[model samples]
Target: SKGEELFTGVVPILVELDGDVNGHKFSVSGEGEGDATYGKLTLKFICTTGKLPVPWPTLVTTFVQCFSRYPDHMKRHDFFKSAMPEGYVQERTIFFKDDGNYKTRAEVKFEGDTLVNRIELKGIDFKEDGNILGHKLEYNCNSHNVYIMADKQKNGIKVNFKIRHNIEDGSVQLADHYQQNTPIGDGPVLLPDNHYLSCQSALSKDPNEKRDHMVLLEFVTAAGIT
Candidate 1:
């Protein structure tokens, strides 16, 4: 259904990521990018920054927001959205670690595509442009690539994420072309691949651009705040 309207509102969310009190909630919706040999991965989502928890006032209401338009080409085949039985959408939730602020999560919905659903089925070949929501450049937007191994635990959705960054134009990219579902948590020390967790010019356009990175966050599922 390359040109067909995406199933929204009613489409069940297979995964979710949210932020702090003054944060944005990423309500992810889609099916697991099923297997090919078995056929396509069509993705999408809606982004919103709603006002919630506050003991004082609110000015810095700014926070991470993600929204995708699914500008990529969705084929009429299995292993993609087609494989899932109609109305049988899958689900998962990611509450970014602790009370904090920063980059990326908003980028998730920029491309209007789902990131977690596909990780359990295959490794997404790093696409800087990400997935296209429409048929061309307009609706076909871009965002970061995110991947992880998470397991619902007592401390929350404990996860080991491997997020990659783009140098040419500056964007996030990670989920690659297997399903790593075990929350193989990080350590005091880490690997070079994960050093990306600490982005330098995360939201920069040039080398001399201001350096701003991220660390923690919280999640509150909104009901009507758009």
Candidate 2:
């Protein structure tokens, strides 16, 4: 199936750590390194200014924005190494599914003293046998909202989704959606309304160099956005 190109979109997100998060170091292949296997760990960092009712915005933005990134082999340093400040406590956990080889869960709690906000992700797969399929993500720094999607394929149809989340307001936006119901020559298609989202970065001269640059143009071209 590898040669068949059964599916293609933004590459499957493989697990990698920008280094120790909340006092735990995640390995290249998504393994917890150093001190105990798992426990209440305290990591330090300076807080970014924001008015989201609690410190949860600081922690969420710090992790998803600063810590997680497109895995690059040439890049040796983790994103959070120099980005975080002198010190502030962050409580979190990294849990495994079965024995301890693959990571199936991760969670973080944000609060100055009492827990004010929490973010949890479950069913993260990067094992060889499985094709990195669906995962459930719940982020509630405030209001309760959930929208989860993943590369799902069946009966000659392939579905892909690209989404953007707002940590500050607990909002989510769909940046792109791609669906192919038939083979190449049969003509692929999109939503009947033919709607898609585009942004200013697609017009940039050298967008790729920007840290916030995304693949809007490429997706638009492939989808023939008007």
Candidate 3:
């Protein structure tokens, strides 16, 4: 389920941007989000250092710290967490390559709903937020389970991930109608046809002269986090 509680942990990572140490360890965290998605948690870890080659002292003590919390994030979906059959064999696909990192898939495996598992596929990808540039992609996922460990490799960084939800009945509801949409308050409203990722701003006034508006947070992963 989506709202289920899950453990969040910090992975000690050292990223190399342009062949530099970029000691960007202590760069991630985790938690849960959504409803009916019970027992589900979302793992969110990021490089907050703003810059790489993180502090040696902070890197020493703050290297690994994992916790749990429920935040107003998104939901557990298949796009972020892949859905695989029980005992499904993972055939290596093309390595995910980008400017800053080289990605290679070792192997893929599936663990059933009980402590579900998946490959921790990853590689260094730059984070681009509007005009501001990000340090890393912060590859993350949402689920109703515990932290999935990563695979260690000699040539590049390795990761082992568990896909959230289950094949039996744990499939994630991506988005459509009400599956992944938020509810509207204040008044009754209707949705338009063929609505893409959108934002709305309204202006209102009271007898006493008060300016008000509503900011609806809708779904739009296609907004391009890359």
lDDT, candidate 2, 1-226, per-residue tens = 1211111122221122233233232222211111111111122222222111112221222231112221233112221111122111222232223211111222221123121112232223233222111112223222211111211242122324333423333434222323232212222211122222221111122334322211111111011123
User: Residues 1-226, candidate 3, lDDT per residue (tens digit)?
Assistant: 2212222222122211121222223222212221212212222223333433321111111111111222223222211122111112221221112222212221211122222222222224422321112322221223212122212221111112222211223333121111111111222212212211211111122345232211111121211111
Per-residue lDDT value at 134 in model 2: 16
User: Considering summed lDDT, which 10 consecutive residues are worst modelled in model 1?
Assistant: 187-196
**Per-residue lDDT for 34 in model 3?**
18
Model 2 local distance difference test score: 0.22
State the displacement of the C-alpha of residue 175, model 1, in Å, after optimal TM-score superposition. Answer: 11
> lDDT values of the candidates?
0.22, 0.22, 0.21
Stretches off by above 4 angstroms in model 1 are: 1-13, 17-22, 31-33, 36-40, 48-162, 167-226
Report per-prediction Cα RMSD to one decimal: 17.6, 21.9, 19.1
Q: Positional deviation of 199 in candidate 1, in angstroms?
A: 20
- Residue 166, candidate 2: alpha-carbon lDDT: 36
For candidate 2, the per-residue lDDT at 84 reads: 21
